[PDB]
Each structure stands twice: as structure tokens, then as C-alpha cells.
């Protein structure tokens, strides 16, 4: 606990679990005895902390999902458990730098973007809540790929994070278990049997969740692959490879659906084996049984993904707890909620019914029995609308009979939710409008939040300093204290302090740069980021298209005054994604013409920040001066990168779309800059259809751009290397980037007006963190607790 | 002892807490066994470290036992013993409440090893510790080490041995020191010399188990490696096949005694050598060294020819890499290697074929070539005309498709050949390789086998350990020789009681476990005959059933006639692809159940197969052991080392004279043991005549029922000519002509029976075998190779 015996710790550990000395002892070495040390002062809140689950038997919460995208944990650790300065001391002291044994660890990256990051947040909040939450994942040999740019394309190496071991897991072999595929079903008069199974063995791990502050440890339980024990010898071994390749890798796409078996493997292997733990843990506590079932325990489904776990908790109920099919039913509506976490159609999950005949038979029919108690009411409450029943449907008919996961976790759900108010509002009555007429009070609306720790305490320290001696350390469990901050408003000094913090953000985070990158950096130009997955709809391109404008009217005229800026633009593409590939090429090739141009200079620099992590996000976020949240209206569920440069001090420039909206409610719409259609203007540009050819034959600037990027003056080499790009501007682009080119370029130009008027701009900054508190997960979860899981601190 | 127990206790309670995120109400056993072991580790941490450092300022040659294979079995009651701290932690676990036993037998074997030569490099490292050599054992850490074994329906079946599933808590990954190994791509010849380009690469993550010297500080270092893809059409394919890079050292080559020409294992092969050669070199490098001091201050033992290419692989290094000369180079290599011959059995010698290895490492073979040029060139300057000599002495085998003889290999790249028992070591030197001794005689040497008396003694036997201990002292366990003064106790009558009682404490405990694993009613007061070694034919357990049948028909011939009652014991795993091995198993079997359950038999004779014979189990069978069986034809068993743990463990050997059978002889006196059959010399005369199995069953009533019996269905009714292939095996084709011995064995058996009716001549003759055991303790062995080959010092 004290710094002396912090020490003590350290060099015990240094000793006795790594064998080593000050004189052999590596980097890794060091910070392995570094995490052993902060892992020792969990073991005792964490034993005490299940324990207490277990004599009390509060409500338990199970969040269901394939990703968690957890970043870093000691740091993390060090600050919920009140020990980073007494760490840092005691490191220091032993003649070494934490910062550097910090950067040794590997980020636990098992999720693809905001639905993994979203959980990792909501497991911390939890936590700090101090419920009796468990999150339920598949512990990925490997995870999100780590991502490099060669010739300036992105090049994908495996994220091999678990090679040098990690401290953070507990392996519990005691609660193995096994989960079948395949088999088939038999209807005997003892009840319906699956056999001749394939089997697959599930060892959890457990990693410790420590809320902020409060004595409370919970438990992240991630599960591994095994083959179980029971030709040629030396094939049949090496054969074990394929059960335990269910758990081996992520599936790298990020919004995306992609019918893969292993996928479908992965999402009943983690459903089975999550379903058959907490019915044990169930049947273990102070418990016809079942009916207190849903009293005791809510499972979230995060998207579709885990959708298998409503046949399979019915497949548990009735052919091994023999309940009958009603009863089974009715404790199984009230046990899940649904969370839907997007509407873009290339995200819905469709699974051929073939495949998963083949897979899960026992499901199949469950599925389908499902169904015909849906259609029968259906068609009983509409005897003539039959086409009501075709749109309701859990079963796809054109073509290639396919599963509508998000319609099974509908009916099999008590709540369902969107993530942002204008994304569950469409969920409600525009996707799902056939469901919530029927059900209206089963729709509700849960805004994303990102936690304060994290993404404060954790990754702007200064900022929270500044923040704290103010207004007291009471913000840090409750972010709606920061409204307090509006105090300060005209306070000229607390705004010299706020600008201090930041561009110490900014010339820490340069020595990064130029440490990473060859590029110099103009430490006083405006740090504006656009960090996010590679997509179309996000929309890198519009981005794209206003640098490579300012870029032009830079040439245009060299000696007329420019703000100077340092574009950042970063973020991992799915491996078959071929448009997010090309404009990763297309942004490198920009910024290779833009940095290197002597008549350009220090105005204007271009990064696209490789290997774009969690812990990353710590890095940059802090450092930005304007945030990019500028997908197409109407495409962007929520967003939650928009929330972190909020609370870090960046004004945002963006659509109404997502949690933009809400951020604009929060802190005046004035306060941002906003631009762009609306999802009403999409709509009528829809219904009247988008001719992409008009915008480019109206604007000269975005024709030169155009035209650069047709003809080869970014990739001479290569002069068509961009056809590609250019045929989806003008024939295929569902996210109409010419349409908004416009109204950004304008904004743009309002944000370099304002940036050149410090006070002006930090007061806005000011306000906007003042009105962030509304994204705290803290209240997310809060909200969760009280309209879904019926659950309390 | 005082505050040992108290603090072992406290630092136990340490580790299921802060290790194990235990408490005592939701702890497991296997949690308790991991809590135990992690307080015990600790206390190897200050040793191992010191040990090492000491190596480094002090600058001893080194020796390294490069190996496929180490069989370890358990690591908890070794380590505790060797550090002096078993009592104390009995003492600690007792108190806390535990079954200190319950928690030993969580542990998991390494059984990285097939048989008898992985377990010797296991019982050198022990041994080599205690003598405080500065020794590395350098091997494959397997995923899976030798299979599990178990008996379904009579025959054997086998199961993946997923020793790490839990984790173990003796191993220290060492990630600093990984290196890359490289496999395929071809070889360009440029003015920069030869390049090997085009390679697939593979990295070696070496992992370290400490290795206690008995009672004396020090703490060696095993390390083994484990294969990973490197990080460098479809993602998530790409990323699934990244297992077949880890498909290198995923499981161990269950055959014993048997080349196996596959790729993966030629991989293994090269991947240990590649990565130890690399990681020596590193460490001559980072001592104060340029090369020419490298056979001063390295040895490099091959374990058998496993390793071969670590001598072109040196030379590749040598040449390619830190560009010496060849004839610089080729001089280093022969000082640094040692080769140690392991077997003359033909189906062991490996023999591989020139195009699987031009297509794995071109060049590599473009180097063994070369040697092969120059070592000819020799021998036609030496004798011009004798052109079959040059034939006899290639490492090339031109016969149909040209195959590469590794034994010859390693000899001409070594300094020094030896056997591993005197008979054997002279076979190898006068027959095998004849042409090659008569150039270099001095190079081939012998150096008898040796079990650890630690793990064989100690341990497994602590009943025997404490008797002798009472007698003359605990001197004995550093010098095994000491033995010969239990000498003193020929007449005493009360000693030999006490002897009988500690073998009869070793059955009764045994017997516990046997009914409980097996249906079978054992009889305590019987005879228990043993034969616990790996399934082969030349091992011959079919001799053995052959008795075992043979009595059985007596039994019934007449139910009131005197009959030593025998409890017959006959384990150990047939290779998976071994055939006749595994219909010699299901004969066993069924032989048993036929014998097990006859009523008229009853209590005079029961048959236990004993499933999944291994290190840990060998432990608990041999203390209880009263009749050993080595019968190997005469000429096949190089040594055998079962043999040694009988003798020392209080059992009385039946046996030919085979392997290191002749050295324990001459030992305890050919008399005081029960030797029989054809030796060496009748063998090679009843070759030369022409083997003709018939003959024998013609002119032996006993035998010829055993077999109409075999051959009809007496054993398997359901399956008539079930055992055909055996009876068609021992008729026209037995190279290790089971009949031929047949007559002499069962005689043989007669007298062991005679000889166990009385208690204070059977006593008498073990007491005499105990005390002249002390040649086979491995620190003796250890001790001759320092001196002879390796040519360093107790550090
Ligand atoms: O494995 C040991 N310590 C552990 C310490 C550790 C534990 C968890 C995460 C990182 C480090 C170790 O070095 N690793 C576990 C990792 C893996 O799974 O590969 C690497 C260890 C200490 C020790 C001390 C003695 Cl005397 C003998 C054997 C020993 N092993
Ligand atoms: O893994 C931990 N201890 C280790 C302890 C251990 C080490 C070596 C062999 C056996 C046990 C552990 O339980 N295992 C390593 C094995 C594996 O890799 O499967 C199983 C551990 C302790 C701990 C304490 C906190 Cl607060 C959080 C996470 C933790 N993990
Ligand atoms: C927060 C975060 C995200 C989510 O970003 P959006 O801009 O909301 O898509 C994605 N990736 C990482 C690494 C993050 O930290
Ligand atoms: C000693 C030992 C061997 C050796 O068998 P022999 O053929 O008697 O030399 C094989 N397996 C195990 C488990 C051993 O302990
Ligand atoms: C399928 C998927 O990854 N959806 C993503 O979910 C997160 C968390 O709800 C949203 O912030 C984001 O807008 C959305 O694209
Ligand atoms: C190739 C091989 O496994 N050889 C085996 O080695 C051991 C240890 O040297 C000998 O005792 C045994 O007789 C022999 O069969
Ligand atoms: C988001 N995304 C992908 O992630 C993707 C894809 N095609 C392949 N992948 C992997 N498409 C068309 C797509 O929009
Ligand atoms: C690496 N890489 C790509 O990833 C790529 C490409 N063209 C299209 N893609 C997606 N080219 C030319 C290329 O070198
Ligand atoms: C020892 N041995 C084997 O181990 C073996 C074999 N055939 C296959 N195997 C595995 N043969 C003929 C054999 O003698």
C-alpha cells in the first residue's frame, strides 16, 4: 500500500516469479513484476466481492458478448485501486520509468471497434456501480489483427497478445465445460435427445473488473477452446487443432456481416457454454426452481451475435430441466434483453437455415417451433395481412432460406433498445415497426456512454488534475458534476490553465509523431482527428477530399494567411474490404504529395496513425483540438470516439447523426460545428435519387480534386490506381459524399476562423466538456439497471 | 527446524491466496497441489540464479545432452527431496489440515519421452547436478508427450497427454532468447559464398526447468523449445495456419526403437538443433570468448542420432555464417561433438532419404555431401583398392533410393563413440562399425548405463532408503558404491526379516491399487512377477505369456499339486502403428481374463496387464516387485535400465545375457541371478544353421498345447484365428527366436519358484544384489563421461 513496501513487492516478484536480477532482468521482466505487484491488491476485494454475490444473491446481470475491447489493464488498475502515485514513486525510486513498462503490455484487443469498447465500459461502470455484473466473451487466441502500412497500403500481422502470458487471467478449470455441434435429434418418450455430437470443450478465464474506488472487483469470464480426451496417431492429435480453432481468432469486420461457419461455430460455442454456467451458478445458489429465475438473473444481448442463446436456454429448460414449452418460454422473455446496435443492412445477421440445420439441429427446430407460436398470433390478431406475416418472420424465404437473428431476438426478449435516441427511434418505428405496434413498451432507447476513468483519469491526467482542484474529485462517479464548470466561464486564467493542458497533450503526443513518423510537426498547427474503423460510411473520403482542397488552395495562393494544421486520419480496415484498403492508399498518397511539398511547409501535415488501438485512443484523443464525427445522417447508430474528444477538450465537427445529436442538445448546438443533410434531407435526395455528377459539375474545387485523384497526381505510377474510388463517387456511393462536400468545406473554414481566436475557441471547449456528463457509462448503466434489468447498487 | 514449518505454512497460505485467488473453502485440490509446488519453486529461485551466475564468472566447459527426448515424470517430491525440504513441508501440509499424498498425485508427468532413452538423459540430469557439472539438457517441449494408454474391450487404445492443459509450474518461458529456425528455400552460390535463400522461418521459444543437484545448491538448467509462427489470400485462414508452424513440436514421436521417415519428425529433428547450436554459439559469444577456444569450453553429447544434423548445422554455422575455413570448422565440430549410440536394431537406424531432406534443407545436404567427399577421400588414399570399403563407409546408401546412414554421420563428426554397456559398446566397435574402429580405435569407447538413486531409491522406495540408511549410514546416496558394505548382513537373520517386511509393505500398498484399477482379487502372499518395459518383440513379453499360459495348463493338468502362487505383472505401451505389438497386448489380455477367471486356478495365479506404464507408475510397481523378467534375445537390449531399478529396488532378475544383464552379473555374481537362453554366440550359430520355430514346438509337449491352444481359440473363442498373425510370426518369421529360448526359460521359472518357497535364501540373494548395485548409479556413469569424453570437472 506504501511506497516502501511497494517496493519490497516489486523486487520479490522480480525474484521469485521471474527468476531474475537488476542485472539480467529485461524491460518485460520489470513490468511483469509490476503487474504481479498492483494484481496482489485485488485478490482480497475480489474473493470478498464473489463471496458477497453469493450470500446475498442480489440480482445478477450477464452481459453477452463476442467482443471486449479492453485496451490495457495495469494502468487501469493502478487508478481504480487508488495506487498509480504510490507505483510511480516506487518505480521511480527502483531507478526505473513506469511509462516505459507500461508500454509492454499488450492490448487485449478482442473486439473490432465501439460494440467491443462499448462492453469493455460498461463492465468498468458496473463495477464502480457496484453490481453484481458478469461479462461473458470468447477469450481469442488472437484478436483484432495489429495493422502496418507498407508502400502505403494496410498490412495485416497476426495480434499474437497471449505469447508472452498474461497476469490479468485466471484459467478456472474447475467450471470446464463441454458444448456440442452438430449430432441430430431424437424424439423419444423421455424427452428429445441430440446425439452422435461433436465435442468441444469451453475453459473460462476469468479476468477481475475493479470498479473505481469502491472495494468492488467483478469478474469478466472469457472462455478458451479445448478438445476433449477420450488412423494415424501423429494426424489425430494434430487434428485437436480444429475444435480448438473456434476460440484461435476475432473476425475482423466491424459492422459488417459475414456468413463464415466458424463464426456461427463461435457464437453458439460461447452462448452454450455462458448459459450453462449460470444456470449451474443458479442451481448452486439459494436457488418449479426456476421460476425465480428471471428474478435472479438478466442476460443483455449485445447486437445479435450471442442471438443463439434464446433456443438454447429454452433447449436447456425443456430437454434437460424437462420445463414445459410455455413455462420455458415466458422465463426466457423475461431473462434476455435485446440491444440493437445497428441498422446498416450489410450488418444484419442472416444465417442460411441449411447451415445451421447441419450445425445446431436441436436449435433449428426450436427456431422454428418459435416461429409458428409468433406467426399464430399474427395471424389471429390480423386474419387478412399476410404479408405482415412474411415481414415478421424469423425465416427469410426468397431465395436461400435464411434466420433473421434480430427478429428471434425480438420475440425472445423483454426489452430491446437502440443506442442513441434518432437510432432507436428508427429501430422502433421504421425497422421494427410491425413489432413495436404490437409491443410499444417493449422498445427504449439506452444513449452510449464511455467511462471517465478510461477515458479521463486514465488517458488526460492533467485534464482531470485541473478538473478536480476546481470542483472537487466528485465528478469522477457522477459526470454531470461538470456542469458545474460553467462557473468559470468568463474565469480567464482556469481558460490560460485548460489551454496549457491540452497543448502539453499536443507536444507530448508530437514527440510521438516524429518519434513514429518521419514528418516534422508544427506543434502550434490545429490537431484535427478522424480515428475510427475504415468505412464508407464513416466517411474518411469527405475527409480525404477537404485536404487535398486545402491542400490546392495552399498552392493556389502561398503567401495568403492559412491556419495551420496537422490532419490525422487513422484506423484498421476489415481485411476484405476492399474500398476501406483503397482509401487507406489513397489517404497515404495525399499526405506523401502534402508533406514533402516545400510550398506547402508548416501549414499543413497529414498522418494516417497506424495500428489504431485502445490504447492509442489514449494517446491521440487528449492531444486533438477538432474531432471528425462526420458519417452520412441517419448511418451511425451512436458513435462513442465522439463522446472521448468531448470530454477531452476538442470541439467536434459532424452531422446530425448518432450521439452527435445528443452532444449537441447537451452543450447548445452552437457549440459544435454541425453541417451536412439531415435524415430528412437523405430521404428526399433518396426519393428524388443522387446524380453525384451534378456536385462535381457544380463545384470547381471538388472537380480539381476529382480530377487529381483520376488522373494520377496522387499515385503517378499508378495513374488509374483510383478508378475504383472515383466509380463509387459517381455510381455507387449510398453514403453521398459530393452531396455533403459543400457544407463541410464551409464548416471547416468556420473552424479555422474560430481556432484563431483563443479565447474564443477554449470557451467553447469549456462548455462542451461542461456538458459531457451526460455520456458517462456510469448513467448508461444506471438507466440499464432501472428500465431492463431491474437491479440496483 | 525450527520456524521452517511455520514459515512454509505461512508462505503456502501466501500463494493459494495471492496465486490461486484461493480460499480454503473454494479451494481444489489441484489448487492446494499448485500452492505447494509454487512454495516449494521458491526456494530453487536463489540457487538456480546463483548457480548460473557462477557458470558465467567462473567459465567451466560446459556440457550439453542434446536430446528429442527427457522423460521427467514428476518434478514436486524430487525437488523436495534433492533440496533437503520433504520433511518440512510434509510437516507444513500436515498441519495445514492436507493429504500431502493427495496433493503429489494432482501432479502431471512430463513424459516427454518414449522409454528408456529419455528417461537415462532424465537420470544424467539429475545426476550431472549433483555432481555440480555446469550441464544444459537442450530438447523439444511437446504439447503432447508420450501418449495415455488405456485398455478397451482388451486392446490398447490411446489418448492425447495434454500435460499443459493446467498449466505447469516448473517451466520458465525465457522470451529474450528466442530465435528463428528456417526451413525449405534453396541454395544460391554466390561470390559471397553459398546463401540459403527462399526459407520459411519458424521461431524457438525456449523454456527453462530447473534442474536440482541433490543436496548441494546447485540448480542446472533444462530447456526446451516450442515452436511459433513469426509474425509476418484469406485473413482468418492465414491466421489458423499459423498451427502448422506450432505443428512442430505439438507431440512427441511415440516409437520406440523404430525409425519413422517422416517429414514433421525430420522438422523436430532439425528445429532442436537449430535452435540449440544457436543459442550455444550465443552464449561462447557472450562469456569471454574467437572459435578456437569453443571445444574448450563446449561439449555437445547426441543423444543417439536424433540430433545428427546438429554437426552439418554447426558446420553451416561455422562456414556460411561466422566464415571460417571448412578445415578450421570441420575441426572445432569434431572436438565439440560426442556420439552416443543407442541402438543396433535395424529398424531403428535412421536412414533418410536424400530428396525429403534436398527439399527441406538443401543446404544442409549439400554440407553432408561434402563431408561424405572428403571422408572418402580418405579412406581411397588410405586403401586404393579395397572399393567395397568406401561402399561400407559412405554416408550415402545408393541402394534404390539413396538415403542418408546418420549413424555414420555423426561418427566421422565426432571425437568420441560409445555404447551404452559393454557388450553392446563392443558390437558396436568390433561388428557394426568394424571399418570404422580399426582407422580411429580409440575413438569408440564404453559407458555402462546408470539410474538416478535419488528418484529410484528415495523416492520411490522409502521404506528400503531408511532400512539401509539404519545400517550404514546416509553416505550411500552420494556414492552408491557404499552399498557393498550391507555386506556385513549376510548372516543376520533379523535384517532379513526387515527386508521382507519393506518388500511386503511395497506389495500390500500396491495391491490397494491394483484391485482398485482391476477387477482382479490379488493374493499378498503371492510371488509378484514383473515385466514393465515398452511393447516389442525383441523385448519378447510373448516369452513371458508363453510361461504364463504354460503354467496355467499345469494348474489344471493337477489342482491339488504344490504351485508357487504368482501375481504376474506385464505393462508398458505398444507404438500406435506397431502391429504385432498390439496383438501381443490383446494376447495378454485375453490370456488373463481366461487365467483371472478360472475357477480352478483361483488364488494360485492372477495376470495384470498394466495400463499406461509410465515413470510414476514404474515408481509405484518396481519397490513392490519380487521377480524382475529381462528376457531381450540375446544381442537386441544395447543395456536396458529397468534392469538397474529392480536390482536396486529389492527384486531378483530373470533374465538373458543380454545388455547391461552381463555387467549386473558380474556385479552380484552370475549365481545370484537367474540367467538362461542362448547368449550372444549361440545366436549368431543358430543364424548361421537357420532358425527353424517349428522344430522346437515339434519336440515340446508343453509348448506345442500353449500354442494349438493359441493358434485354435482357446483364448478368443468369439475370434478363432484371431491371434493368426502371431502364431504365422513365430513360425516363419521370428528374428528373435521366442521357441529357441523357450525350453530354457520355462526351467528357469522352475527354480525362481523353488528358490521363493524359502524365505532366508530368496532374502539372501536379494541382499546380494542391493549391495552390488552401486556400479549403476548414473553419478557413475556422469563421472566416466567427464573424464573420457567431455573432459571437465565437478564445478
Ligand atoms: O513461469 C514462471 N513465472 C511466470 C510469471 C508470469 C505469470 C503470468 C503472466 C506473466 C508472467 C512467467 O514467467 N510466465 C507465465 C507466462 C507463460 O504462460 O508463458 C511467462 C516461473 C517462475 C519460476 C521459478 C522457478 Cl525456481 C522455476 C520455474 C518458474 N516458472
Ligand atoms: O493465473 C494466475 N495464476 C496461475 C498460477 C499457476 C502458475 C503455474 C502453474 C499452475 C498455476 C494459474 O492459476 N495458472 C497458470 C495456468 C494457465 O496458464 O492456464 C493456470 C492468476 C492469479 C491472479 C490474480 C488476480 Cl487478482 C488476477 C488474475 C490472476 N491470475
Ligand atoms: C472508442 C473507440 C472506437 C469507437 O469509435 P467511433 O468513432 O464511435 O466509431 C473505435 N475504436 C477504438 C480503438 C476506440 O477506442
Ligand atoms: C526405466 C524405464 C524404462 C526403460 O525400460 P527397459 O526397457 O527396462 O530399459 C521405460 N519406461 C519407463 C517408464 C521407465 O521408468
Ligand atoms: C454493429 C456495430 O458494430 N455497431 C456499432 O455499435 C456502437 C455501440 O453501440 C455504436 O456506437 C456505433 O455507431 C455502431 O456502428
Ligand atoms: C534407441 C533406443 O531407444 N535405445 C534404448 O536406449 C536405452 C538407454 O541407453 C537402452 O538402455 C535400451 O536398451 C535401448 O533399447
Ligand atoms: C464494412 N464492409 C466490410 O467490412 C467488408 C465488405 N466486404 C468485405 N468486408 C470484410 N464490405 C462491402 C463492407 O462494407
Ligand atoms: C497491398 N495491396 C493491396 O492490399 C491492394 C492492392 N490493390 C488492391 N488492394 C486491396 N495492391 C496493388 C497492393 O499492393
Ligand atoms: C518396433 N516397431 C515399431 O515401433 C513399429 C513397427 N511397425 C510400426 N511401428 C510403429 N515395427 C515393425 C517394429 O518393429
Same mark, same amino acid.
Given at each position: ?406 427478429? $428471434? ?5 423483454? !426489452?430491446?433498445?437502440?443506442?442513441? +435516441? @434518432?437510432?432507436? *427511434?428508427? %429501430? =422502433? ?27 479521463? $483519469? ?5 485534464? !482531470?488534475?485541473?478538473?478536480?482542484? +476546481? @470542483?472537487?474529485? *466528485?465528478? %469522477? =462517479? ?316
Amino acid at each position: 500500500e506504501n511506497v516502501a513496501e511497494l517496493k519490497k513487492s516489486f523486487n520479490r516478484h522480480l525474484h521469485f516469479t521471474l527468476v531474475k536480477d537488476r542485472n539480467v532482468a529485461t524491460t518485460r521482466d520489470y513490468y511483469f513484476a509490476l503487474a504481479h505487484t498492483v494484481r496482489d491488491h485485488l485478490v482480497g476485494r475480489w474473493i470478498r466481492t464473489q463471496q458477497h454475490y453469493y450470500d446475498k444473491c442480489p440480482k445478477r446481470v450477464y452481459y453477452l458478448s463476442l467482443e471486449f475491447y479492453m485496451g490495457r489493464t495495469l494502468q487501469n488498475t493502478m487508478i481504480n485501486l487508488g495506487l498509480q502515485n504510490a507505483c510511480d514513486e516506487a518505480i521511480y525510486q527502483l531507478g526505473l520509468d513506469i511509462e516505459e513498462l507500461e508500454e509492454i503490455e499488450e492490448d487485449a484487443g478482442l473486439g473490432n471497434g465501439g460494440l467491443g469498447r462499448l462492453a469493455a465500459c460498461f463492465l468498468d461502470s458496473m463495477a464502480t456501480l457496484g453490481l453484481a455484473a458478469y461479462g461473458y466473451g470468447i477469450r481469442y487466441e488472437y484478436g483484432i489483427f495489429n495493422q502496418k502500412i507498407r508502400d502505403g497500403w494496410q498490412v495485416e500481422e497476426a495480434d499474437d497478445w497471449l505469447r508472452y502470458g498474461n497476469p490479468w487471467e485466471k484459467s478456472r478449470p474447475e467450471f470446464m465445460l463441454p458444448v456440442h455441434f452438430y449430432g441430430k435429434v431424437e424424439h423419444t418418450n423421455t424427452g428429445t435427445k441430440w446425439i452422435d455430437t461433436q465435442v468441444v470443450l469451453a475453459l473460462p478465464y476469468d479476468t477481475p473488473v475493479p470498479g473505481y474506488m469502491n472495494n468492488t472487483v467483478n469478474t469478466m469470464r472469457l472462455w478458451s477452446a479445448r478438445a476433449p480426451n477420450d488412423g494415424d496417431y501423429i494426424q489425430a492429435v494434430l487434428d485437436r487443432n480444429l475444435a480448438e480453432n473456434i476460440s484461435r481468432v476475432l473476425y475482423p469486420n466491424d459492422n459488417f456481416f459475414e456468413g463464415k461457419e466458424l463464426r456461427l461455430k463461435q457464437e453458439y460455442f460461447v452462448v452454450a457454454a455462458t448459459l450453462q454456467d449460470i444456470i449451474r451458478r443458479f442451481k448452486a445458489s439459494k436457488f418449479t426452481v426456476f421460476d425465480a429465475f428471471p428474478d435472479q438473473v438478466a442476460i443483455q444481448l449485445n447486437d445479435t451475435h450471442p442471438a443463439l442463446a434464446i433456443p438454447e436456454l429454452m433447449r436447456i429448460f425443456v430437454d434437460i430441466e424437462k420445463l414445459p414449452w410455455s413455462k420455458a418460454w415466458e422465463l426466457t422473455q423475461k431473462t434476455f434483453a435485446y440491444t440493437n446496435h445497428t441498422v446498416l443492412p450489410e450488418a444484419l445477421e442472416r444465417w442460411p437455415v441449411d447451415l445451421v440445420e447441419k450445425l445446431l439441429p436441436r436449435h433449428l427446430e426450436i427456431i422454428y417451433e418459435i416461429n409458428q407460436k409468433h406467426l399464430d398470433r399474427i395471424v389471429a390478431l390480423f386474419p387478412k395481412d399476410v404479408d405482415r406475416l412474411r415481414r415478421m418472420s424469423l425465416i427469410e424465404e426468397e431465395g436461400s432460406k435464411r434466420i433473421n437473428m434480430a427478429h $428471434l431476438c425480438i420475440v425472445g426478449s423483454h !426489452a430491446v433498445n437502440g443506442v442513441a +435516441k @434518432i437510432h432507436s *427511434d428508427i %429501430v =422502433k418505428t421504421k425497422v421494427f415497426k410491425d413489432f413495436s405496434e404490437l409491443e410499444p413498451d417493449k422498445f427504449q432507447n439506452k444513449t452510449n456512454g464511455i467511462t471517465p476513468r478510461r477515458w479521463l $483519469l486514465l488517458c488526460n491526467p492533467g485534464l !482531470a488534475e485541473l478538473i478536480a482542484e +476546481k @470542483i472537487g474529485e *466528485d465528478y %469522477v =462517479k457522477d459526470l454531470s458534476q461538470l456542469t458545474k464548470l460553467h462557473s468559470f466561464l468568463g474565469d480567464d486564467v482556469f481558460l490560460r490553465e485548460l489551454a496549457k493542458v491540452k497543448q502539453e497533450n499536443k507536444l507530448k503526443f508530437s514527440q510521438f509523431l516524429e518519434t513514429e513518423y518521419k514528418v516534422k510537426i508544427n506543434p502550434s498547427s490545429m490537431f484535427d482527428v478522424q480515428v475510427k474503423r475504415i468505412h464508407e460510411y464513416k466517411r474518411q473520403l469527405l475527409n480525404c477530399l477537404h485536404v487535398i482542397t486545402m491542400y490546392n488552395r495552399i498552392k493556389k495562393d502561398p503567401k495568403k494567411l492559412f491556419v495551420p494544421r496537422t490532419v490525422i486520419i487513422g484506423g484498421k480496415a476489415a481485411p476484405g474490404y476492399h474500398m476501406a484498403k483503397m482509401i487507406i492508399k489513397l489517404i497515404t498518397s495525399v499526405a506523401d504529395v502534402v508533406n514533402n511539398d516545400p510550398m506547402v511547409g508548416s501549414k499543413l501535415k497529414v498522418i494516417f496513425l497506424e495500428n489504431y488501438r485502445v490504447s492509442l485512443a489514449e494517446k491521440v484523443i487528449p492531444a486533438t483540438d477538432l474531432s471528425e464525427q462526420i458519417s452520412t445522417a441517419g448511418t451511425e447508430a451512436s458513435g462513442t470516439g465522439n463522446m472521448k474528444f468531448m470530454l477531452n477538450g476538442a470541439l467536434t465537427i459532424g452531422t446530425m447523426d448518432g450521439a452527435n445529436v445528443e452532444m449537441a442538445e447537451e452543450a447548445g448546438e452552437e457549440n459544435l460545428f454541425i453541417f451536412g443533410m439531415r435524415i430528412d434531407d437523405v430521404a428526399a435526395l433518396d426519393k428524388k435519387g443522387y446524380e453525384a455528377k451534378e456536385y462535381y459539375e457544380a463545384l470547381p474545387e471538388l472537380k480539381l480534386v476529382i480530377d487529381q485523384i483520376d488522373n494520377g497526381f496522387f499515385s503517378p505510377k499508378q495513374p488509374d490506381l483510383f478508378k475504383d474510388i472515383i466509380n463509387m463517387l459517381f455510381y455507387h456511393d449510398r453514403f453521398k459524399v459530393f452531396a455533403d462536400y459543400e457544407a463541410y468545406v464551409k464548416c471547416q473554414d468556420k473552424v479555422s476562423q474560430l481556432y484563431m481566436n483563443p479565447k474564443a475557441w477554449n470557451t467553447m471547449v469549456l462548455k462542451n466538456i461542461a456538458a459531457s456528463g451526460k455520456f458517462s457509462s456510469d448513467r448508461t448503466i444506471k438507466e440499464y439497471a432501472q428500465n431492463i434489468w431491474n437491479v440496483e447498487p
